[PDB]
Amino acid sequence: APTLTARLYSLLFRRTSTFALTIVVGALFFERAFDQGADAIYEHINEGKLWKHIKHKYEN
Amino acid sequence: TNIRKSHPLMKIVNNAFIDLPAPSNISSWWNFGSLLGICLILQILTGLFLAMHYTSDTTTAFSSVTHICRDVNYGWIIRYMHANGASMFFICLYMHVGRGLYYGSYTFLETWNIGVILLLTVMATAFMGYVLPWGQMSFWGATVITNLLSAIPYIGTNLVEWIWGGFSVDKATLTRFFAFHFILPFIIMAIAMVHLLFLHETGSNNPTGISSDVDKIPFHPYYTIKDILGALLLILALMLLVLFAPDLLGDPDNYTPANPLNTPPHIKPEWYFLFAYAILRSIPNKLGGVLALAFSILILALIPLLHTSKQRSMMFRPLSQCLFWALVADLLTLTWIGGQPVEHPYITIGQLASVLYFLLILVLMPTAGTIENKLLKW
Amino acid sequence: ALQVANAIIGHYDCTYGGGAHLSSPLASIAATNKLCQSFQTFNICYADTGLLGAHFVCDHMSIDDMMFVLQGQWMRLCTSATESEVLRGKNLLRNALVSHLDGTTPVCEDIGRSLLTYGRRIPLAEWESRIAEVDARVVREVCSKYFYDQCPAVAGFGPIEQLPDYNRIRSGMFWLRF
Amino acid sequence: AEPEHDHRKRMGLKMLLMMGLLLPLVYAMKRHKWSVLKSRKLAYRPPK
Amino acid sequence: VSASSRWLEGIRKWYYNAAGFNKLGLMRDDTIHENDDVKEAIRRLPENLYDDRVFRIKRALDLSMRQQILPKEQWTKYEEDKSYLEPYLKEVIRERKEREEWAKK
Amino acid sequence: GRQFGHLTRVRHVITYSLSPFEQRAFPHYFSKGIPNVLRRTRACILRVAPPFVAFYLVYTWGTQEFEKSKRKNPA
Amino acid sequence: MLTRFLGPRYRQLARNWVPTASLWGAVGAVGLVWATDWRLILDWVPYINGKFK
Amino acid sequence: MLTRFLGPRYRQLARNWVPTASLWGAVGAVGLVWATDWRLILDWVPYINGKFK
């Protein structure tokens, strides 16, 4: 009853509509956080290299 | 009284996908049936979105395919999903046939015989598809495979020129090959339904080859969820290929435009034709070589007549297990030879492997089944 | 409130007069479509636990339909119970309680049992007060608490090939629409 | 030859990371349902 | 009384163990392919042999799903393997072949 | 055309099952899982592996023999 | 003509299903907004910002 | 192995169906010859002559 999976179930999972709402709201914030991360990993593993890092050489 | 159970359309869905009694029992080797369906609709969907931009004229066909890969927003994933899905379609086909061979599933005569038609239809479809981008492999692929008909005595030449549109592969050949390649997957889809209709009559076989009515489970949720997992593995296997190695399973020679004056030095089939290719060229005779090719796939229809064993499955049959694996490894041998030039060691070992293919199915596996019967005092 | 809800679903057997017209949707559908021989709802009480549900007796080709309709009623009462049927259940319980406490023996049992379980005798006017409080909102609250998305205990005996798999009985304990 | 080169490798890393979430998750989903069968116990109780 | 018949029996026992239906607690006749002759022989079986057969097959299909096997102590010993279906099957084959002899005339 | 309630006849068999929410999806996943795969491997290696090594030997020899044949020496 | 479905029970039945039908609309609105990247609404959402500045 | 179908009754049954199977071949031969305009055979046929002289 202190436990967090319990309160997750009680507030959000018990009803299928709330379950669906928590998935769609969940999917919005996942798409941001994953694309933020996975781009930043890909960009860091290719340190210069891409036209995003070349950009500043040719002017405004 | 259930809406799921009595509605004339949902009836069909429920009796196939939900309430269908299935063995408690069936392993990962039973995942390939749904995977073939996934493959079928993947190829339909990508193939549709490729058809939206492809032109079937000789002057422009290569240009349209590369227009897809460079200019069309995400045309590259669609094109190589399609290309590697066709190879995925073949991996799943071969697994699915082999499962059927091992587990004695061919004793479902109609299901199996329709399956043999499905193999031949998907082979003919994928031949046509490879002709479409009008690379070098496209042209000579179209030349050789159409010319197989020229081995039919008296009328074979007339037939080849009938499907060509003239004396050579030409403008007429490519436009009809686009049309034939468009419709045939939908014909396949219809035959896949008849395949399923004959199957539901008996329900599934299982690893033991023993009747499983004593222990059926509902298709949902068990095989709905096992199928989802299996499809997610199919997506991994496909998306590994398109995103990390798009051209691993194809030919570089199909990136040079078609050229009727020069056949390339190295020419081999698409990997999934290599065994049958190896069989045909092991025979230094025109009529015999093509008769062996036809027989290399049409043999599957004789396998039910050659089942000697008092058991259905190979699970409790060690002699047959050994000879099954000799068949797989021999098939792996034939795809290796198919990949190599017609020179010294390769000619003989490919001839011996061809002989072994036909000897294993015709003679050696039926005899193994009799010996196994005699050993169990049966 | 659970007893009110159980009264709404009620009981049935094949010797009940007028089947089609019975108020309980389960009892009505079971009578018309020959879904069972009998069913009964129950609420067996022990110290700090119990068994709340139903039992039925049916032909081999009817278990699936019976289970479907039973579960739908539980689900319906959790989500969408209405004022009028709750009155009917309330009335059925006043009539059951009063008709039960009729004779020296059932009253003596009730004195004896109640002093073991409640430590008092709960007088008839108290039960009526407790019954009267129950409305549709209470039935929806109290049924949801015990029924909705809970794991049932299931017992099957006889020709039970068509007894639904447990996962599919578990799935009958919630509704995707709600 | 291949202007898509950098885009396909970006989607590839996303594919691998997504699959590293989804493959164990769908596995758990499938195992959770197959629980009822995989732990089931049989007894045979014939008469006399 | 033969060294050679003991040898054939020892190849047979070897094969029996290799076949490994006994590992799932199956008898030989549990593993037979159900054709029309066999389905009838099963139909002809008395109550006890019928009910034993279904449980053995149940137990095997259960194990085959878990991809597991019985403790070695509980494997069916080759010497203890009851040929319970065979006499019924011989009779069903014998009756069919009589019909087929009559269909010839 | 086959339905539950019409499949076959079974008598005298009790099945005990537990809810998915009562039990673990990965009960003793490595402790029992690894011993099993090894047991399954041992069971089948002699049936599956020897044709593929037989492929491997003919592969290794065939590639080697083809390589050596397109070299000369005394001519 | 639809007068079958007008009375105290159907009034209660509609009232019961109202929080659910409201939440299914709330599901579908966000799902449309998410699927299309609906620029009009997502500019408000304090962390979901693909457009700079 | 096909020995089920060998005996005096099946010998009589084959003999009965022989004029019919012969006539169904005669149907199919002419039908193939007609459909293709099989030049080899139709040159013999004394009035069916699309080729002059």
Ligand code: HEC
């Ligand atoms: C030459 C044999 C053959 C080919 C090729 C084949 N099938 Fe089958 N298929 C079978 C047999 C036999 C079964 C029954 C397997 C069993 O019950 O063990 C079957 C079963 C299946 C199943 C359901 C059970 C299972 O095994 O997963 C599906 C679905 C399926 N086939 C669809 C397809 C599709 C789609 C294709 C490709 C167009 C196809 N099959 C190609 C013979 C084959």
Ligand code: HEC
């Ligand atoms: C709606 C039409 C359509 C359908 C359906 C279709 N395709 Fe294609 N396919 C195309 C077109 C157009 C191309 C040419 C573009 C290209 O080469 O990728 C093509 C290309 C191909 C290629 C050559 C791949 C390459 O580029 O090297 C193969 C192989 C193939 N298809 C096989 C299949 C198979 C197998 C199926 C499913 C039975 C199928 N296709 C479904 C239209 C279709």
Ligand SMILES: C/C=C(C)/C=C/C=C/[C@H](OC)[C@@H](C)[C@@H](OC)[C@@H](C)CCc1oc2c(O)c(OC)cc(OC)c2c(=O)c1C
């Ligand atoms: C309108 C008429 C139609 C559609 C006729 C269709 C006939 C289809 C066949 O049967 C379905 C066929 C595809 C099937 O044969 C059984 C294959 C396995 C044949 C394998 C095959 O591939 C080759 C190939 O791919 C090549 O290019 C790279 C070139 C080739 O020579 C050098 C071959 C080749 O020599 C063979 C045998």
Ligand SMILES: COC1=C(OC)C(=O)C(C/C=C(\C)CCC=C(C)C)=C(C)C1=O
């Ligand atoms: C009794 O065995 C069966 C399975 O168990 C292994 C399946 O998994 C599937 C699922 C197959 C699918 C999704 C392909 C559908 C094909 C078309 C052309 C729409 C079917 C039908 C089946 O019958």
